[PDB]
């Protein structure tokens with residue numbers, strides 16, 4: 169079956185066939201669309217076919233499909249699964265797997281960079297201290313003094329589900345949030361629960377507005393342990409504005425390395441529950457969402473006041489005006505400090521080119537419109553006008569429940 | 579099943595059961611979601627009619643009553659004998675209001691019950707249509723104090739006597755392909771504009787020429803008519819600070835009236851059902867004015883603001899965008915012409931959504947269309963999960979008449 173996708177701005181129509189290889193469900197039925205819904209131990213049986221599917225794709229990609237090497241590997245894995253209930257991926261297969269989970273991530277607008285990914289094999293890791301060392305190395309390599317490099321560190325795969333490796337932090341670098349008795353919040357509201365766990369686990373919180381959280385790491389299913397990231401490894405950018413000299417006095421700053429650490433990487437049926445990965449920020453993530461979401465730093469008013477905008481009525485679009493200035497400030501500061509970052513215009517224009525390229529060479533590009541379109545200036549970015557098809561391909565990155573809700577304490 | 583919807587900003591959760599009453603397909607499947615796709619017999623009729631009459635009588639607290647039963651049989655006998663049926667005035671009004679209520683892509687449905695319905699089912703000629711339309715335009719405009727309304731022309735019979743308003747909107751600007759290769763006016767209407775010329779209209783070749791109405795009655799060929807200039811309210815666009823703005827020579831019409839859709843009520847199809855409300859600022863300022871394939875004015879405005887257009891990272895497009903939208907809202911409000919900003923409108927929709935969830939069990943909404951084209955996440959709807967599904971009565975898209983008409 170062929171599915172057409174049209175761009176209402178250029179009239180360019182594309183044809184998708186890749187979706188035919190979609191296996192997982194979407195949450196939508198022929199009667200209801202759940203497109204705007206945030207989030208709608210395997211057995212030997214359902215494992216080998218998943219392993220086979222993957223190996224077929226791997227060998228096909230290297231132009232060795234049907235080869236003796238291809239056939240022996242399948243036999244090798246089958247024997248391994250029947251003999252151990254699981255199997256180990258070759259280094260090359262792991263790299264290939266990691267790159268494709270990224271390539272297949274329908275909610276990522278930065279996939280034009282999918283082939284450039286440094287993969288760190290941490291499958292020989294056995295303890296929390298070990299994980300800490302691996303994570304420090306990842307942070308330093310990826311930061312690269314501001315010239316960010318995409319990377320991912322892969323810890324031991326899940327086995328019986330009782331010895332899972334997990335990074336309890338949602339991101340390797342993030343600011344603490346503290347609920348005050350008066351009901352207000354100091355720091356990042358998004359991380360209040362995790363901050364409370366860190367404190368309960370022994371962390372001495374400086375209780376400031378931008379405290380870098382400590383790492384809470386779980387190795388081989390054991391109770392998590394706290395570690396402080398060497399401060400000198402944490403690159404941060406003070407936020408100032410090119411024209412507004414009072415902006416810097418708002419006391420704002422952010423970290424330069426965005427690294428998602430709470431997702432699950434699925435490759436050939438295997439589950440990698442600890443797989444922190446990082447790239448670089450698209451400006452709006454910080455300037456629109458992290459700073460202006462009502463449930464995040466919520467700085468719109470305070471900024472609007474200093475600009476002395478007419479905040480008496482919404483029709484003055486004072487929120488919209490303050491929003492642009494803030495985002496101008498984020499880009500300006502990062503560029504000035506020579507810390508990699510991309511604005512939403514460049515990022516979306518690149519995605520459209522990546523997407524068209526993918527349709528031609530791969531026959532498709534699963535994309536979540538709701539997530540791809542930036543949180544500000546939507547229609548003035550090309551992705552807004554682009555029809556998209558969302559479906560799930562493996563390898564992939566999946567959400568997984570927060571560990572404190574499932575962990576069996578020892 | 580019973581689906582739940584969460585607002586990630588307020589944590590508030592709502593349970594949807596109304597979707598269980600959906601009937602038409604969504605275009606999506608368990609393997610693929612098409613949420614961002616602009617457009618994914620007597621035996622067939624009675625069940626549809628029954629479904630409608632049932633919900634109607636239920637709304638008037640007379641479900642299962644003799645009246646309910648009587649009406650059901652009357653319509654039943656009418657379909658069997660005449661292969662179709664006529665709605666009572668009360669059923670027509672209820673149907674139109676509910677089509678709006680069910681329009682998943684409309685952010686202003688909190689106003690759904692306040693709709694003036696003009697029954698034009700007695701219309702027989704194109705001239706009759708023109709008269710009905712002028713009256714609608716005048717009633718809705720109301721000297722700037724806009725009132726929502728819809729005019730319903732005769733329903734479909736054998737598909738060969740369909741009433742159609744060829745225009746996409748009652749009021750819209752023409753577009754012409756110039757020698758330069760460029761386009762004069764609204765690119766979105768180039769094609770329709772040519773069918774008018776190709777039909778007789780004497781295009782003024784301007785940047786903002788109000789198009790003539792191309793009305794089709796009883797399947798006959800469409801006729802042209804000029805909407806009385808004095809009935810077309812327009813607003814010259816100026817900025818409250820940039821005195822140079824007025825020089826861009828921009829203006830827009832005050833009455834947004836969709837006229838190319840099809841109204842479905844109890845199986846019956848009303849192929850000519852122009853309806854109107856009032857504008858939400860961004861529709862004009864963001865889409866009509868800045869869409870690359872529309873008036874595409876960003877650069878011009880940017881230049882006059884004197885900002886660094888050298889690099890995209892200076893966000894000159896975003897700055898210019900905000901100003902253009904401040905100007906649209908400013909002008910309409912200055913001339914006392916009804917208009918709502920995206921902040922106010924989305925806040926209202928969230929309120930409506932909550933009312934609909936507790937009183938009706940849900941509210942079908944298309945996130946992709948509900949979220950404004952600018953400042954997405956600073957509006958509450960961005961953080962509001964929404965379930966999209968089709969409920970009838972409904973407003974449907976339909977083929978442009980010139981691709982089906984047999985002259």
Ligand code: HEM
Pocket residue numbers: 270273275276277278279281285318319320428445446447448449450453510515539565
């Ligand atoms: C090179 C820089 C990159 C840019 C500019 C980019 C940009 C983005 C943005 C803007 C989002 C949405 C984030 C949000 O709203 O929370 C996103 C999501 C995502 N990206 Fe990328 N990305 C980059 C690299 C990567 C890398 C290295 C990976 C994986 C190896 C990746 C995997 C994903 C995934 C899985 C999501 C969805 C996360 C979620 O559901 O919260 N991205 N990306």
Ligand code: HEM
Pocket residue numbers: 678681683684685686687689693726727728836853854855856857858861918923973
């Ligand atoms: C009174 C104020 C109203 C407001 C502020 C409002 C606002 C909106 C907006 C912002 C859109 C999207 C327009 C676009 O992107 O092209 C829309 C679409 C729509 N509205 Fe409303 N609306 C109003 C009245 C009405 C009325 C009176 C009806 C029906 C009787 C209605 C039916 C629809 C339909 C069917 C759509 C989708 C149109 C399409 O698919 O192009 N609206 N509305």
Ligand SMILES: C[C@H](O)[C@H](O)[C@H]1CNc2nc(N)[nH]c(=O)c2N1
Pocket residue numbers: 204205206538539540586960961962963964
């Ligand atoms: C409810 C809705 O799904 C939610 O607010 C989504 C919308 N689009 C998004 N897009 C991105 N990139 N990131 C997000 O967190 C969201 N949140």
Ligand SMILES: C[C@H](O)[C@H](O)[C@H]1CNc2nc(N)[nH]c(=O)c2N1
Pocket residue numbers: 176552553554555556613614615616946947948
């Ligand atoms: C391709 C995509 O569906 C298309 O650009 C949609 C996006 N959201 C929209 N939302 C509204 N209100 N109006 C539109 O015309 C669109 N266009």
Ligand SMILES: CCCC(=[NH2+])NCCC[C@H](N)C(=O)O
Pocket residue numbers: 339426427428445446447448449450453454457458
């Ligand atoms: C790993 C990918 C890099 C990236 N651009 N974004 C990750 C999510 C970051 C999150 N949106 C934030 O503002 O912190």
Ligand SMILES: CCCC(=[NH2+])NCCC[C@H](N)C(=O)O
Pocket residue numbers: 834835836853854855856857858861862865866
């Ligand atoms: C009839 C509904 C009222 C309304 N706000 N919009 C209809 C579509 C208008 C179209 N988006 C425009 O900018 O002209």
Ligand SMILES: [Zn+2]
Pocket residue numbers: 196200201202203606607610611612613
């Ligand atoms: Zn869907």
